[PDB]
Swiss-Prot record:
Name of the gene encoding the protein in the UniProt record: CIAPIN1
GO cellular component: cytoplasm; mitochondrial intermembrane space; mitochondrion; nucleolus; nucleoplasm
Cofactor annotation: [2Fe-2S] cluster; [4Fe-4S] cluster
Included range, full protein: 1 to 170 of 312
Descriptive protein name: Anamorsin
Subcellular locations according to the entry: Cytoplasm; Nucleus; Mitochondrion intermembrane space
Source organism per UniProt: Homo sapiens (Human)
Modified residues (Phosphothreonine): T143
Swiss-Prot/TrEMBL keywords: 2Fe-2S, 4Fe-4S, Apoptosis, Cytoplasm, Iron, Iron-sulfur, Metal-binding, Mitochondrion, Nucleus, Phosphoprotein
GO BP term, pick one: negative regulation of apoptotic process
Note: 'Ana-mors-in' means 'anti-death molecule' in Latin.
Amino acid sequence: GSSGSSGMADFGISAGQFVAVVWDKSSPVEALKGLVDKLQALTGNEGRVSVENIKQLLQSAHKESSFDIILSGLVPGSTTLHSAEILAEIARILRPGGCLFLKEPVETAVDNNSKVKTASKLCSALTLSGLVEVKELQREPLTPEEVQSVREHLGHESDNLLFVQITGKKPNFEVGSGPSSG
């Protein structure tokens, strides 16, 4: 029976690992200024918080297993859709024995034109992209900003919406061809 505490419903990061925060052309600047201070306290000096761009991540792909926990779509006042190319890229940067954190919205309103995926597909997207043990953790209502942002920038005019955070772990099966030998 270890003393202290075992668990964390806030994040779960230790000193030594590298944390990243991807943002899109929409998220404010103030919220981002404090979002780093929160993670900086967890990493301290051993760890480091590196902020990258979702649009640049494709043009400038990072090495494999370079990061441990990369936050994707977790910035206040930010509504962007993720594709297989993005979810697949984030999985490559993440380590084989780490954790992933993503938060994408879900639509369930009867309309003539569909754009946003469903809750089920949102979870399966990570399971098919290249993750294991993918399951919904929790969900939180929308904010006065996110509700208008979806209509301001994107312009969908969606009234019925809901945010759902789903985590995804990295498996251990990528034995292709040609071992790394320099």
